[PDB]
Amino acid sequence: VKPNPLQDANLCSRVFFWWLNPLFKIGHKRRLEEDDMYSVLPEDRSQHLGEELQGFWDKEVLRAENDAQKPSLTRAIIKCYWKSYLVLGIFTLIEESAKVIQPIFLGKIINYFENYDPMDSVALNTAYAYATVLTFCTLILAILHHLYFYHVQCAGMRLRVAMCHMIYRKALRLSNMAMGKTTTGQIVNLLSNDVNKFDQVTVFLHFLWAGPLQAIAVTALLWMEIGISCLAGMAVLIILLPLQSCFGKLFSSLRSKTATFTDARIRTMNEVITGIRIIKMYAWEKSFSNLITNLRKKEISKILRSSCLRGMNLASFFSASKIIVFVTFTTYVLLGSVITASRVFVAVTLYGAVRLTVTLFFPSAIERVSEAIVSIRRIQTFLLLDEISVGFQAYKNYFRAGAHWIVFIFLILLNTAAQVAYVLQDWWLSYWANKQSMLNTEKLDLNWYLGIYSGLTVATVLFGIARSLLVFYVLVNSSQTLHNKMFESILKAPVLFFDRNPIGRILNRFSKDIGHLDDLLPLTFLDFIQTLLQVVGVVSVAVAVIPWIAIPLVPLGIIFIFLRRYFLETSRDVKRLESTTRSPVFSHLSSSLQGLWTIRAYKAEERCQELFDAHQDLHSEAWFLFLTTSRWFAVRLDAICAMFVIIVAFGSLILAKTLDAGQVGLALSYALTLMGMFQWCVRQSAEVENMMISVERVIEYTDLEKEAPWEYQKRPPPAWPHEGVIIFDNVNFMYSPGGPLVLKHLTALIKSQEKVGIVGRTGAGKSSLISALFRLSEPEGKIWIDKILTTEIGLHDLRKKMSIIPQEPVLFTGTMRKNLDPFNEHTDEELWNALQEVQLKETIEDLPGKMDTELAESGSNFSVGQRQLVCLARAILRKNQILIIDEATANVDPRTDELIQKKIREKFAHCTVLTIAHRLNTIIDSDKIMVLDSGRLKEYDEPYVLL
Ligand SMILES: CN(Cc1cnc2nc(N)nc(N)c2n1)c1ccc(C(=O)N[C@@H](CCC(=O)O)C(=O)O)cc1
Numbered sequence: 001v002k003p004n005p006l007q008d009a010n011l012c013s014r015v016f017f018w019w020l021n022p023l024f025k026i027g028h029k030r031r032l033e034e035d036d037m038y039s040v041l042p043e044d045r046s047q048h049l050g051e052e053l054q055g056f057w058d059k060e061v062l063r064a065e066n067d068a069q070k071p072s073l074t075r076a077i078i079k080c081y082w083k084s085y086l087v088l089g090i091f092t093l094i095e096e097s098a099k100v101i102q103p104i105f106l107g108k109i110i111n112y113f114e115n116y117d118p119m120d121s122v123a124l125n126t127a128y129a130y131a132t133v134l135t136f137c138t139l140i141l142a143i144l145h146h147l148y149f150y151h152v153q154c155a156g157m158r159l160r161v162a163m164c165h166m167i168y169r170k171a172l173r174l175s176n177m178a179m180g181k182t183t184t185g186q187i188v189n190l191l192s193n194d195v196n197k198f199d200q201v202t203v204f205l206h207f208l209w210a211g212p213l214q215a216i217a218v219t220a221l222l223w224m225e226i227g228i229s230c231l232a233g234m235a236v237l238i239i240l241l242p243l244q245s246c247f248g249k250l251f252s253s254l255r256s257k258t259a260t261f262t263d264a265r266i267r268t269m270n271e272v273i274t275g276i277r278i279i280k281m282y283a284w285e286k287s288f289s290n291l292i293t294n295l296r297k298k299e300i301s302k303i304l305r306s307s308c309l310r311g312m313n314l315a316s317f318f319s320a321s322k323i324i325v326f327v328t329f330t331t332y333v334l335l336g337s338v339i340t341a342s343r344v345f346v347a348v349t350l351y352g353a354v355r356l357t358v359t360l361f362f363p364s365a366i367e368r369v370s371e372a373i374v375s376i377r378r379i380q381t382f383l384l385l386d387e388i389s390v391g392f393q394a395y396k397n398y399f400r401a402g403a404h405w406i407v408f409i410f411l412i413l414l415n416t417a418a419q420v421a422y423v424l425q426d427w428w429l430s431y432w433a434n435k436q437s438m439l440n441t442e443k444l445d446l447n448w449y450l451g452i453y454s455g456l457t458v459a460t461v462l463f464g465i466a467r468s469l470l471v472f473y474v475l476v477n478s479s480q481t482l483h484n485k486m487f488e489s490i491l492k493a494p495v496l497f498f499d500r501n502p503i504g505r506i507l508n509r510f511s512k513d514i515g516h517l518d519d520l521l522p523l524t525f526l527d528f529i530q531t532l533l534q535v536v537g538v539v540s541v542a543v544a545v546i547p548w549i550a551i552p553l554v555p556l557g558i559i560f561i562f563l564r565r566y567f568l569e570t571s572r573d574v575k576r577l578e579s580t581t582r583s584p585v586f587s588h589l590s591s592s593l594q595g596l597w598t599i600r601a602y603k604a605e606e607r608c609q610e611l612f613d614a615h616q617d618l619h620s621e622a623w624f625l626f627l628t629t630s631r632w633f634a635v636r637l638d639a640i641c642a643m644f645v646i647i648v649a650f651g652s653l654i655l656a657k658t659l660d661a662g663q664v665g666l667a668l669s670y671a672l673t674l675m676g677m678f679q680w681c682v683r684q685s686a687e688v689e690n691m692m693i694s695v696e697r698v699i700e701y702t703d704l705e706k707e708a709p710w711e712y713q714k715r716p717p718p719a720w721p722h723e724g725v726i727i728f729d730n731v732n733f734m735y736s737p738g739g740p741l742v743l744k745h746l747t748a749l750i751k752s753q754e755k756v757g758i759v760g761r762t763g764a765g766k767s768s769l770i771s772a773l774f775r776l777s778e779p780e781g782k783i784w785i786d787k788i789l790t791t792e793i794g795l796h797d798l799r800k801k802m803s804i805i806p807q808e809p810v811l812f813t814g815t816m817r818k819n820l821d822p823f824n825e826h827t828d829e830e831l832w833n834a835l836q837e838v839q840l841k842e843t844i845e846d847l848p849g850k851m852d853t854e855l856a857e858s859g860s861n862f863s864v865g866q867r868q869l870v871c872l873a874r875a876i877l878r879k880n881q882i883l884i885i886d887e888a889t890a891n892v893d894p895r896t897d898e899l900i901q902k903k904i905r906e907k908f909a910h911c912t913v914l915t916i917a918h919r920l921n922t923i924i925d926s927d928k929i930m931v932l933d934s935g936r937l938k939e940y941d942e943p944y945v946l947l
Contacts, residue, residue: 004038015147017632023625027570037577040620046613049158050165056080057166073380074373077159084155085205091148092206098137100217103349105134106668107342109653113661114342114437124656131649138645142638142675146631149203153627156199161616163195163379168589168612172596172605173387184593188586190382194375201372204365211362218354225343226332233328233347237355240320244313245363251309258302265295266511267813271858273506275810276498281774283799285491287822292487300480303518307476310523311468318530319418319464322425324351326457329429330450341433341661345669348426352673390689394696402478411470415529418463419537425456430662437661468526475522483514485702494707495776496735509697516694524691528684534677538670542648545659545667552647556640564682567633574626581622585615634679641678645671708778711794720786721801721881723752724912726773731781733768742768744935750928753910757923760932766916770884774799803880807888809867811859815852816844820874834877838869838903865896872900876907883908885915887922 005019013019026036042048056076064071112127171187222230272279272288279285325348333339399408432449490506543550592608599605648671652664730745743765750756760766771777775790775798783790790798811819820831835841843866844850855861868891875883885904891897901922904913917923929946930939940946 002035002037002039004041006038007041015143016635017146017628020628020632024566024570027573028566032570032573034577037621037625040617040624044158044161044620044624046161046165046616046620049162050169053080053162054166054169071380071384073383074376081155081159085202088148088152088155089206091144092210095141095145095148096210096214098140099353100214100221102134102137102672103346103353104221105130106349106672107346109134109649109668110342110345110661110665113656113659113664114340116656118657127653131653135646135649138642138672142642143635146635146638150627150631152202152206153199156202157620157623160195160198161620163198164191164616165613166383167191167195167379169609170383171593172599172608175386175388178385184590187593188590190378191589192586194378197368197371197375201368204361204368207361207365208369211358215354215358218350222347222350226328226347227335227337229328229332229335230347232331233324233351236324236327237358240355240359241363244316244359247309247313251306254302254306254309258299258306261295261299261302262515265292265299266507268292268295269510270503270507271812273498273503276495277776278806278810280495280776281799281804281806283796284822289488289491296483300476304476307472307522308469311472311526312465314523314526314530315461315465315468318468319422319461320355321352322422322457322460324355326453330453333446333450339429339433339436341430341437341665344429344433345665348669349672390692390696394692394699397699398478398695401481402474407470407474411467411474414463414467414470415533418460418467419533421456421460421463423537423541425453425460427666428452428456430666434660434662471526471529472522475525476518479514479517479521482517482698482702486510486698489702489704492706493704497705499735513694513698516691517698521691521695524684524687528681528688531677531681531684535674535681538674538677541670542644542667545663546648546651546655549648549651556644560637560640563633563636567629571629574622574629577622578619578626581619585612585619588612588615637678637682638675641675644674708795710796712792714792714794716788716793716797720788723786724750724754724882725752725784725786726750727784729781731772731779731783733772733777733779735777743772746772746932746937748930748937748939750912750914752912754927755913755915756928756930757915757917757926758930758932759917759920759923762918764932764934766932770804770886770916774802774804801880801882803875803878803883805871805875805883805885807886809864809871811855811862811867811870813855813857813859815854817851820870820877826877830877834873837907838873838876839899840866840869864891868896868900872903881911883911883913885913887916887918889918 005022006014009019023032023036026032030036053076056079057073060073060076060079061071108130109127112123117123167190174182219230219234222233268288268291272292279288328347328351329339329344428449436444539553543553588611599608648667652659652667727749728746730747731743732741732745733743734741746769758766758769772779773783773785773790775795778791817831820835835844847853859867889897901924915923923929926943928941929943930937931946
């Protein structure tokens, strides 16, 4: 078998994940296929995780049925995992208490600089001890966290597998009456969507009691430093809760109505791609073009508002750390107290540790718990029924299509000012403290120091909103300008491009690639850019105070570039492995429920359980590597993130004769916030480069094959088709320019007022002549028609002056007035005349509207009869000379074909009919008959010499 190195591995080797080093060496240069993944632990099998939960549930059902109450499933999980969760909670409490001691010991180092004496050896040792104590909370938070996180993540897959095991076990005991209601789709959905919500619940389950505790623990510490002025900092942070939720209820609505404009358009596409040979033959491209162009404008106008709302939300999330500090400190100063550099940065650190945690971790645990409870209720109600007895080019082509190169310089200059203001607003307070500490009653005027601070506070918000708005607009304009190019490039492709590519591929592209281009790209781009810009500012602030922290920065930054690549090279296969191991489980589940009555004949219902367990163990193995490979990188990242802080603190302490308290506090208060932003910035690039593939495959289009232009300046006479004379010569045809033939050298010439017919068996080149004079694939061979040719004329002025009767009639979703005449070139009464001349006016007045009656789903309300008859009515109203009749019959012998053939008898007056015959008797009193066998003709004038 495949033993895993997770076991038989001592301590101090599982905190750094040292047992996963060899696997990387295999994934770096060999592309492991399926047999380089380790097995699962003996306590992670399906049969072990399912039987104990089944026993607990069977005991709970009896316990809750003997006494008159309802059986509950939520208790059967707490009766099992309570010990594990409360054991894990110890480290949660430890790491939550460790995040409060750091700002307490941060303020004790600045106090040493505030009272400095160059001849003193007792306080330096105390400062070193304080630094050593502070240098360990970071290590505790950075190193020992990734094992507890892996454990709390693994604590969910066990339940996820145990639920599916008993679900499948129950799915084989359903009666014939209970199965008549329950479909296979809802069962595979319950097993495919409702059980996947148990993976992210245990991660956010510990915030419901750690939020309010930490809030009070920090609020109690602010009173000892500043006083009442902390309330002015806590009164704003609460207001952010109802404001960010109410507007949420305003956003979701704007997301729903847009769907109404998104699906319908797609539906229209499903009717233009299926039937190109009819739309292109009738020259009806402009109608569908105008019908499609109108919906995209409304879709963009509805998307812009939601984009602006999301941009405003992000701008409010960016610069929310400046209002609280400004308010609390102007309140603290206006009361009559003196500002010092010992409490400012401590309060800043406390506020920054509180607000993010609260406003990002509290409103999500409730959603997670609600989804989990809904899923658990569904699964419980299900089990209670009775039983039986890329590259730089991909970015350049995507960015340069949005705006000119001036807007890019403008947005760069706009992005490179918000961070400068963000840093200067906090530097001004350090300058104020340093200027105040140098006094000996010669007080400081508040006007200047309070006006500069307000200006620096307002500029930050302004430059934070403008950048987001501009970025969102520029990135939406790109999709707006690419969708067009896609449409007018795909609309002009020849029939050879549609006869080989499936419709589902094109529809899937047009839907999901444009959805990705419109919805999630600008948000992720802006978030990544903001999180990346937030780190260079911290690095520059750290460097500008101590210029000697630029020497180790190069070795600390060189390692990351290689580490990211060395990780991705082997991490870019776990997703494929997981999907390939996950799909067969659903496949087997869906295919095993149909042939179920034969599994009851031979009473073997436990072998299928073992097969299901074996199928799920592969997905379990493929999922076990994901968490470990994801945690392998965070430890090495946090190592550098903590070494940076250690170096900063110690190098700043060992230079206590050059610097002062304000700037050491400033440099120390920023280094404690890098660990989260670095992780977020590293994470966002993954999704960016993952979703750029849709952009790249969108740009794959917009440059395809193209037929001849629609029209030239070679205008034919306005009365060109006055007489039907079609000559021929030895023409050879090939669909592809280098494939086989389907037809060979039809040489003839058709007279005017002549009813010519062709006799042949299906497959000998009989159904390809309509593709010749319609030039669907421009061949060699010069075809003269009425003093002009068929090659030096545009495609529209050649197919419009010709009529065609299709084999199988097609109808589009619209009005009866538009289906017979999209481009209005006639009056009102002529439509009634042409429709009664073909003898159908029952259905119209049997219906109310009878002129604007919309159809539905390809007009299934009608039959082949009136469909063929309305195609005949189109041929009637066309008012044309050349008529090509095709015959592919599946209809019945009664009055339909008699009526249509009599109408083609008397209605058509002396107009050059070219007919294709499938039954030898449909030709009645023909004038010219040709027989076309397996590659040429034996043609004669009259049928009297044939037989
Ligand atoms: C706690 N937190 C949420 C978090 C952290 N910092 C923030 N910083 C800002 N400015 N805004 C936030 N939304 C924010 N959110 C985090 C922190 C790290 C990762 C993270 O990088 N996770 C990776 C681990 C790293 C990796 O595998 O590459 C993963 O496997 O999913 C996720 C969320």
